[PDB]
Design a protein around this ligand. Sequence first.
Ligand SMILES: [Ca+2]
Lengths: 211, 212
Amino acid sequence: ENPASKPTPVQDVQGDGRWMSLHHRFVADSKDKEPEVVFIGDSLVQLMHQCEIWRELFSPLHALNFGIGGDSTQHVLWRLENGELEHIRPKIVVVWVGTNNHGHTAEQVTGGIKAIVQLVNERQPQARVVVLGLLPRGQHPNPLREKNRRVNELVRAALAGHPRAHFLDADPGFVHSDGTISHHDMYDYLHLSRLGYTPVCRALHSLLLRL
Amino acid sequence: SNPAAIPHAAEDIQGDDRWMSQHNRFVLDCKDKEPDVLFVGDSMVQLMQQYEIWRELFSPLHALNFGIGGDTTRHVLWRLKNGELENIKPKVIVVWVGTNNHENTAEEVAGGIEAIVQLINTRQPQAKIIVLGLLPRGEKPNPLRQKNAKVNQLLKVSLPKLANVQLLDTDGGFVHSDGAISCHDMFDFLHLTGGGYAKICKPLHELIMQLL
Ligand SMILES: [Ca+2]
């Protein structure tokens, strides 16, 4: 049994129900819009515009952003199965989750991603799926870097040869020769700054156009 | 004994030791930098630097930002006592923390912010402190809005007291009449968008210009 692929919502433990409020908004703002590109994932997806912005390279594409900070694969899966994939017919779906799956192995997380892709291929068969590589994290070398890197390897393999799913490792090399990540690229060594996002969105844009 | 008033480091349970890395960097900044305005607190503070408004309004004031996403009063206290207040002599210190103090009562959170202020004018008695009021959160009415409002009211009464401190509780049209907060002001019903920061920063900037 793989917990990374078992659909489940995030439980409210603070009291303001923000997670469900986002989900419901994503469900509602879609039954009134017809996007060509839909983004879904964790904070890395949610905060994507905290660099340049989201129009000089993404808005012309009529896109929707369904990223929620803190989500793991099983969370994105639940949302996709519970309304976020309805009322719309995008040409491309961008997935970016996995770094938050603490406690799950690279293999489990990889399975989580494969289930997400499969779900999108069944509900939105006309779209092409783009999976972004998990980015390195932490100021210095640490277990999470290895784990994330391993996930990309496994996902790249499972996606290479896939008829309508593409893996894109948009990491320009945030980890330097001394094994460190600069707070200029990642202010908290996890989230991307404005200049950190540039290389990511750049590579993402070059692929979106190719498709 | 108030738990929110007791300094405590945010232990790494993930493994990438990011909390300490940020703290160490702030200590590093304290070494080769000399600011006049010091910003300390949680994501509300940190995220402010990731918006254009920061360069236009605060970068010119020679300001440092020691905000850390997820920090609570305990976490801020620990950082302030462990080096983040050394080698520098800011004329103005902006404090914004408490909205992440889950499990603590409003009274405890107020007490913790007071502990922070007390520690600040102890280490930096020449600095004028500005405490920002906790903002409403959640799309619809919920317990945290009440909790956060009580903290601001409690601070308004306790802050005229203490030395060189004042509570700036600016509030945009965040909570409308229908009781809802627009995702246009807070994208996740907690963190501010650029439009949301515009409503808060302008008033904060004039008070800083004043104090200086
Ligand atoms: Ca996250």
